[PDB]
């Protein structure tokens, strides 16, 4: 039946495999407005999952140090 | 369009702290509003306007003896040429508003059509002749998040003082509902998905799949 | 960046437990408070205000 | 195989006679009937499929086509006015509170989706029970924006709160068109003018500027109106967005709002130019906005050794129509002194960009 | 104090149970390109 | 920490008035430049 | 052949994990993400 | 196989054959939060010292917050 024998190198169970717990989630994106702007919005929230200042905390604890 | 970045640019600087225990927070709000007014005056003078060459090496061009009759000069930058030609098309009221070409324009353009768009007119005109601020804005937005963290911990413990019965049952339900989420992806790890131990709801699923 | 449901749900629990286990006085977090108040940033910053305020008078 | 003794499923009277739709209730009636039954874990599916048919086929579940839908959705929307009343303490404490909060946020996003096509928003504005809820959410978000102590956010619930504003604001974009104010002190305008000064995010700033612009049409500027609640603290901000030369969406929204704010009467123009931090911005931005992303002739031959532009951007078109309307104000109002102080700078932009001479016709005929 | 918390994030998680739940994928023993060779050799031998 | 509050209060109170001084002076200079530009 | 059917199960039962698993469906963030996917861009004019 | 059972028994019978386990075996904290989650459960009828302790910790976090703001003023 032309089924590969287990000696061949296709054999591996999971090489690329994503679980919904590992899906990327929509989050607040941060925008840059020049370098002399302090009245600009600097955020863009369209209904993301964190959609608050919690994303800033996540960035603070993991990547901020 | 503004470019998205990979680091938070600003923070909300919360205001649920009691304004009679922590002081000078209004001083911070006044300083931030003043810096918000100290750069609206800079961006304005970055778009500043200047009128320095109405009439006044490749910046100087010698005009032809024909175009020298619509300018009053025989040399000058190309800006003066295109500006003075437009001024001549404007003073003599030649635009059709009821460009209609004049008599001297016939010669300067070498055209007898007596009617030509302005685009072609200026075509014939051409035919005849910074780091440190990013670090400061990341250092400040790296403190308004530490402030936004300590303020959240204060908000939690203060909302725990009032109604502790309501906060503790919420903590115990969040715990019993989050330790379940984290234990939902430990079934697929490539060393327990080929040992036939989890294949003896992964049985009704094959029923739905075969039916599908 | 690159946050996911697991990375977020495991962050909420960490924040809830850091507080609960602190209410029970089981957590010692003095090596975190010795980064805000105890360092000389509480005194040296005041020693910088003590001179900027005087420079702002002339 | 096909035999009576094998199975009794076709004897002589039903083997091709049953209709092609005899397999249960249709996918729409099933949604409508499983929505008023009291069993949970079932509403979480009906409100999932309605949420799907509001982004893949909204013309099928339109409110006008089914005049028994808003009565059902209000049963999930109204309890939010009580849940949102909390959210300053621990209001979610079990698995039945979240079950009634998500079942409400889904019913709110479904209305937010069905409130985008025309001839469907004409049903929300008729029922006061939804406009009152939107006003309530805007009131709470004003309390969050101002900073008063009567209502605090309890940041741990911000996840459930910042997903309600970004839906009610989108419900206001489609509703602000169908209403026109006639009184000075009026909600739906004091809340938006307060939120705009705080929201600090581009999506809300644009949604608010569009809502305010749509709350000033079909009105005359000769009497008290909603346009008198704002002052030189908010107008000194909407015009400041013109200084932001990093995008082509805030500039368009600000120019559109000013064009809608100026349209009626000439006293609006006299009021807009009162301050000395709003005239200095327009005087030094409206000339430069006629050559924004227009590929200037690139005069660079002064350091070396022309290809004049052909079209103009959307921002240049809007700023052109703005100067057109500001041109014909009066012979004494500030609307003419402004266009006169801008002539020696609009002239250079007319000399370097040909196609403006056809669009700036009305501005030139008035000077 | 049986629990000690530091400024970093890994030790903070390690003190609590969540220590190993901040990884995108669980570690493996059969994804090694050597273990699969040995298993394939044993199968070919049988 | 109260000494910090008194010092920050005095420093902010002094800086706001200094900035408003060198802000109105600059606005006056811009007005003079404006009339010197329209005359030209 | 067995490791090519244990791959379709695990790839057709992991994708359907936010609509079947109870403690994963009705949680916060998962519902927020599901709603966020169906936002429907606003009519410009 | 003749056929005396459902069509779906063979699929599971083929998927659940331990044919590679015999050759794989030849080659190859959190206890605190399991008891704290019930110590709080038993703590949950007075709840007086709980609130007093919470207020005592809030008095510390509002102080580290004041220190953070006292530094943000200098940075600004």
| Residue A44 DSSP SS3 | strand
- Write the DSSP assignment of D188-206 as a string of letters: TTHHHHHHHTT--SHHHHH
Q: Using a threshold of 3 CB pairs under 8 A, tell whether chains D and E touch.
A: no
Half-sphere exposure of B203 (CA within 13 A, CB side): 12
Cβ atoms of H51 and B164 within 8 Å: the answer is yes
Q: What residues 70-109 of chain D have any CB closer than 8 A to a CB of chain B?
A: 89-90, 92-95
Cβ atoms of H54 and B163 within 8 Å: the answer is no
Residues of G in contact with D173 (CB under 8 A): 42
Q: Do G32 and A11 touch (CB under 8 A)?
A: no
> Which DSSP state fits A20?
G
Q: Give the strand pairing for B61-62 and B75-76.
A: antiparallel
Cβ atoms of E39 and B195 within 8 Å: the answer is no
CA distance B28 to B12: 12
| Residue D80 DSSP SS3 | helix
Burial H3-39 (b: 16+ CB within 10 A, else e): eeeeeeeebeeebbeeebeebbeebeeeebbeebbee
Half-sphere exposure of D265 (CA within 13 A, CB side): 17
Q: Using a threshold of 3 CB pairs under 8 A, tell whether chains D and B touch.
A: yes
Burial E20-36 (b: 16+ CB within 10 A, else e): ebeeeeeeeebbeeebb
Q: Do D288 and B14 touch (CB under 8 A)?
A: no
The span from the first CA to the last CA of chain F, in angstroms, equals: 58
Burial D291-312 (b: 16+ CB within 10 A, else e): bbebeebeeebeeeebebbeeb
Q: Give the strand pairing for B61-62 and B4-5.
A: unpaired
Q: Return the sign of the alpha-carbon dihedral for residues B176, B177, B179, B184.
A: positive
The span from the first CA to the last CA of chain E, in angstroms, equals: 56
> Which DSSP state fits D123?
G
Q: Cβ of A4 under 8 Å from any chain E Cβ?
A: no
* Closest CA–CA distance from residue D237 to any residue of chain A (Å): 8
Three-state SS annotation for chain B: CCCEECCCCCCCCCCCCCCCCCCCHHHHHHHHHHHHHHCHHHHHHHCCCCCCCCCCCCCCEECCCCHHHCCCCCEECHHHHHHHHHHHHHHCCCCCCCCECCCHHHHHHCCCCCECCHHHHHHHHHHHCCCHHHHHHHHHCCCHHHHHHHHHHHHHHHHHHCCHHHHHHHHHHHHHHHCCCCCCCCCCCCCCCCCCCCCCCCCHHHHHHHHC
Q: Which of D275, D271, D279, D356 is nearest to D321 (CA)?
A: D356
> Which DSSP state fits D303?
G
CA distance D1 to D158: 62
Q: Using a threshold of 3 CB pairs under 8 A, tell whether chains F and G touch.
A: no
Q: Cβ of C5 under 8 Å from any chain A Cβ?
A: yes
Q: Do A22 and E30 touch (CB under 8 A)?
A: no
Cβ atoms of D208 and D197 within 8 Å: the answer is no
Cβ atoms of D108 and D100 within 8 Å: the answer is no
CA distance D312 to D325: 19
Cα distances from B174 to residues A22, B168, B169, C19, H37, in angstroms, run 21, 10, 8, 13, 11
What's the gap between Cα H7 and its chain centre?
41
CA distance G10 to B188: 8
Structure-token pair, residue D274: 């009162």
Q: Return the sign of the alpha-carbon dihedral for residues B186, B188, B191, B192.
A: positive
Q: Do D154 and B155 touch (CB under 8 A)?
A: yes
Residues of E in contact with C31 (CB under 8 A): 4-7
Cα distances from F20 to residues A9, F25, F26, in angstroms, run 75, 8, 10
What's the gap between Cα E26 and its chain centre?
6
Q: Give the strand pairing for B4-5 and A30-31.
A: antiparallel
Experimental technique used to determine this entry: cryo-EM
Nearest to B16 among D153, D288, D303 (CB): D153
CA distance G39 to D338: 43
Reading phi first (left if > 0) and then psi (alpha if -120 to 50, else beta), residue C4 is in beta
> Which DSSP state fits D89?
S
Structure-token pair, residue G9: 């199960």
Q: Which of A8, H21, G8, A14 is nearest to E31 (CA)?
A: A14
Q: In chain A, which ranges are continuous DSSP H helix? A: 54-62
CA distance C19 to C30: 14
| Residue D253 DSSP SS3 | helix
What's the gap between Cα D83 and its chain centre?
25
CA distance D270 to D218: 20
Q: In chain D, which ranges are continuous DSSP H helix? A: 27-33, 43-52, 70-77, 79-83, 97-114, 128-146, 158-175, 190-196, 202-214, 235-238, 250-262, 267-272, 279-282, 314-327, 334-341, 343-352, 356-359, 361-365
Q: Which of D162, D272, D262, D168 is nearest to D216 (CA)?
A: D262
Which of D157, D159, D234, D237 should be substituted to probe chain A, the one whose Cβ sees the most A Cβ atoms within 10 Å?
D159
Instruction: Count other Cβ atoms within 10 Å, centred on residue B189.
Output: 18
| Residue A18 DSSP SS3 | coil
Q: Cβ of D176 under 8 Å from any chain G Cβ?
A: no
D54: CB partners within 8 A, 6+ apart: D61, D109, D110, D113, D114, G38, G40
Which residues of C have a CB under 8 Å from any CB of G?
5, 8-9
Q: Which residues, listed in sequence order, are joined to residue E3 by a DSSP beta bridge?
A: C27
Q: Do C23 and H54 touch (CB under 8 A)?
A: yes
Residue with tokens 């006056």: F28
Burial G6-37 (b: 16+ CB within 10 A, else e): beebbeebbeebbeebeebbbbbbbbbbbbbe
Residues of G in contact with D54 (CB under 8 A): 38, 40
Q: Do G27 and B193 touch (CB under 8 A)?
A: no
D186: CB partners within 8 A, 6+ apart: D226, D229
Structure-token pair, residue D357: 């001479």
CA distance H59 to B21: 9
| Residue D275 DSSP SS3 | coil
In chain A, DSSP assigns E strands to: 30-31
Burial of B206 (0-12, 13-18, 19+ CB in 10 A): buried
Cβ atoms of B43 and A36 within 8 Å: the answer is yes
Contacting partners of chain E (3+ CB pairs under 8 A): A, B, C, H
Output the CA angle B160-B16-D96, nearest 5 degrees. Answer: 50
Burial of D71 (0-12, 13-18, 19+ CB in 10 A): exposed
D211: CB partners within 8 A, 6+ apart: D169, D172, D173, D176, D192
Q: Do G33 and A47 touch (CB under 8 A)?
A: no
Burial D235-257 (b: 16+ CB within 10 A, else e): bebbbbbbbbbbbebbbbbbbbb
Cβ atoms of D134 and D175 within 8 Å: the answer is yes
Gaps in chain B (C to N over 2.5 angstroms) fall after: 56, 98, 129, 200
CB pairs under 8 A between A and C: 29
Q: Which of D103, D8, E25, G32 is nearest to B191 (CA)?
A: E25
CA distance G43 to H7: 52
- Write the DSSP assignment of D193-247 as a string of letters: HHHHTT--SHHHHHHHHHHHHHTSSS--SSS--GGGS--TTTHHHHTGGGG-TT-
- Residue B62: what are its φ and ψ, rounded to 5°? -90, 120
Instruction: Count other Cβ atoms within 10 Å, centred on residue B196.
Output: 19
CA distance H51 to B162: 7
Cα-Cα-Cα-Cα torsion D162, G23, B164, H43, nearest 10 degrees, comes to -170
Cβ atoms of A27 and C1 within 8 Å: the answer is yes
The span from the first CA to the last CA of chain G, in angstroms, equals: 56
Q: What residues 171-200 of chain B have any CB closer than 8 A to a CB of chain E?
A: 182, 186, 189-191, 194
Cα distances from D145 to residues A29, B21, B33, E32, H18, in angstroms, run 21, 21, 16, 55, 62
What's the gap between Cα D276 and its chain centre?
30
CA distance B139 to B150: 17
Q: Cβ of G33 under 8 Å from any chain C Cβ?
A: yes
Half-sphere exposure of D338 (CA within 13 A, CB side): 29
CA distance B47 to D319: 16
* Closest CA–CA distance from residue F28 to any residue of chain B (Å): 14
> Which DSSP state fits A30?
E
E4: CB partners within 8 A, 6+ apart: C27, C28, C31, E15
Cα distances from D183 to residues D1, D129, D222, D243, in angstroms, run 79, 22, 13, 32
E6: CB partners within 8 A, 6+ apart: C31, C32, E12
Q: Which of C2, B167, C45 is nearest to A55 (CA)?
A: C2
Cβ atoms of D350 and D360 within 8 Å: the answer is yes
Long-range contacts of D269-276 (CB under 8 A, 24+ apart): D269/D326, D269/D329, D269/D333, D269/D334, D269/D335, D270/D333, D270/D334, D270/D335, D272/D235, D273/D334, D273/D335, D273/D338, D274/D232, D275/D232, D275/D235, D275/D236, D276/F27
Q: Do C36 and H32 touch (CB under 8 A)?
A: no
Q: Cβ of B27 under 8 Å from any chain H Cβ?
A: yes
Q: Return the sign of the alpha-carbon dihedral for residues B192, B195, B200, B203.
A: positive
Burial B83-115 (b: 16+ CB within 10 A, else e): bbbbbbbbeeeeeeeebebbeebeebbeeeeee
């Amino acid at each position: 039946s032309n089924i590969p024998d287990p000696t061949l190198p296709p054999t591996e169970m999971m090489t690329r495999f994503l679980h919904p717990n590992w899906y990327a989630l929509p989050t607040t994106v941060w925008l840059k407005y020049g370098n002399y702007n302090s009245w600009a919005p600097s955020f863009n929230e369209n209904g993301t999952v964190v959609d608050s200042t919690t994303r800033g905390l996540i960035w603070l604890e993991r990547i901020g140090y | 369009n503004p470019v998205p970045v990979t680091y938070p640019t600003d923070a909300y600087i919360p205001t649920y702290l009691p304004d009679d225990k922590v002081s000078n927070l209004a001083d911070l709000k006044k300083l931030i509003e003043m810096d918000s007014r100290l750069d609206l005056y800079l961006t304005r003078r970055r778009l500043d306007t200047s009128i320095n060459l109405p009439t006044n090496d490749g910046g100087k061009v010698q005009y032809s003896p024909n175009l020298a009759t619509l300018i009053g000069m025989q040399t000058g930058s190309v800006n003066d040429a295109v500006y003075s030609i437009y001024k001549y098309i404007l003073i003599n009221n030649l635009f059709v508003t009821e460009v209609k070409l004049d008599s001297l324009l016939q010669k300067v353009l070498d055209t007898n059509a007596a009617h030509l768009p302005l685009m072609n007119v200026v075509q014939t005109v051409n035919k005849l002749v910074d780091a440190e601020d990013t670090a400061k804005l990341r250092e400040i937005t790296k403190l308004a998040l530490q402030l936004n963290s300590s303020a959240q911990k204060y908000q939690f413990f203060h909302e725990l003082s009032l109604h502790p019965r309501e906060t503790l049952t919420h903590y115990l339900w969040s715990s019993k509902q989050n330790e379940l989420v984290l234990q939902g992806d430990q079934y697929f790890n490539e060393d327990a998905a080929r040992t036939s131990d989890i294949y003896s709801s992964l049985m009704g699923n094959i029923s739905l799949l075969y039916s599908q | 960046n690159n946050v996911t449901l697991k990375n977020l749900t495991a962050f909420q629990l960490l924040s809830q437990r850091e507080n609960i286990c602190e209410l029970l006085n089981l957590v010692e977090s003095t090596e975190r408070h010795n980064s805000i108040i105890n360092p000389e940033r509480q005194r040296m910053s005041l020693e910088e205000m003590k001179k900027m305020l005087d420079a702002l008078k002339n | 195989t096909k035999s009576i003794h094998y199975s009794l499923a076709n004897f002589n009277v039903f083997q091709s006679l049953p209709k092609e739709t005899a397999r249960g209730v249709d996918d729409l009636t099933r949604m409508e009937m499983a929505l008023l039954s009291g069993i949970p874990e079932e509403i979480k599916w009906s409100l999932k499929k309605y949420l799907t048919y509001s982004n893949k086929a909204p013309y099928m579940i339109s409110l006008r086509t089914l005049p028994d839908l808003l009565p059902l959705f209000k049963t999930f929307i109204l309890p939010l006015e009580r849940i949102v009343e909390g959210l300053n303490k621990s209001s979610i404490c079990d698995s039945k509170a979240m079950d009634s909060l998500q079942m409400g946020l889904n019913a709110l996003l479904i209305l937010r989706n069905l409130a985008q096509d025309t001839d469907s928003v004409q049903i929300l504005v008729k029922d006061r029970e939804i406009k009152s809820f939107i006003l309530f959410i805007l009131k709470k978000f004003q309390c969050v924006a101002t900073g008063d102590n009567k209502w605090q956010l309890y940041e741990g619930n911000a996840t459930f709160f910042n997903e309600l504003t970004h839906y009610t604001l989108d419900l206001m974009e489609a509703i602000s068109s169908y209403i026109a104010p006639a009184m000075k002190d009026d909600h739906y305008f004091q809340t938006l003018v307060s939120i705009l000064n705080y929201t600090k995010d581009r999506y809300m700033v644009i949604s608010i500027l569009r809502s305010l612009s749509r709350l000033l049409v079909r009105s005359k500027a000769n009497e008290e109106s909603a346009a008198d609640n704002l002052d030189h603290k908010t107008l000194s901000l909407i015009v400041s967005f013109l200084l932001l030369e990093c995008d082509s969406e805030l500039i368009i929204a600000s120019l559109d709002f000013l064009y809608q704010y100026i349209l009626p009467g000439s006293q609006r123009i006299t009021e807009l130019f009162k301050s000395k931090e709003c005239s200095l911005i327009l005087e030094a931005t409206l000339p430069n906005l006629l050559s924004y992303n227009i590929a200037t002739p690139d005069y660079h031959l002064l350091q070396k050794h022309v290809k004049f532009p052909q079209e103009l951007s959307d921002v240049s078109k809007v700023a052109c129509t703005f100067l057109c309307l500001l041109s014909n104000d009066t012979d004494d109002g500030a609307g003419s002194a402004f266009c006169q102080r801008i002539r020696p700078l609009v002239l250079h932009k007319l000399a370097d960009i040909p196609p403006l001479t056809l669009a700036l016709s009305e501005y030139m005929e008035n000077t | 104090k049986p629990i000690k918390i530091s400024a970093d994030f890994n030790a903070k998680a390690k003190s609590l149970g969540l220590e190993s739940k901040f990884s995108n994928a669980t570690k493996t023993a059969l994804g090694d390109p050597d273990t699969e060779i040995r298993i394939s050799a044993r199968i070919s031998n049988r | 920490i109260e000494e910090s509050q008194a010092i920050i209060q005095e420093l902010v109170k002094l800086t706001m008035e200094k900035l408003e001084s060198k802000f109105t002076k600059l606005c006056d200079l811009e007005t003079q430049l404006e009339m010197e530009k329209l005359k030209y | 052949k067995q490791k090519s059917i244990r791959q379709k199960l695990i790839n057709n039962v992991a994708s359907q994990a936010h609509h079947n698993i109870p403690y994963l469906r009705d949680s916060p963030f998962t519902a927020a993400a599901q709603r966020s996917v169906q936002i429907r861009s606003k009519v410009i004019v | 196989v003749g056929g005396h059972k459902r069509v779906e028994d063979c699929i599971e019978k083929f998927l659940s054959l331990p044919i590679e386990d015999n050759y794989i075996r030849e080659v190859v904290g959190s206890k605190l939060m399991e008891c704290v989650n019930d110590a709080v459960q038993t703590l949950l009828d007075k709840l007086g010292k709980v609130s007093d302790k919470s207020r005592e910790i809030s008095e510390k976090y509002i102080e580290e917050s004041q220190a953070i703001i006292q530094e943000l003023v200098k940075l600004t």
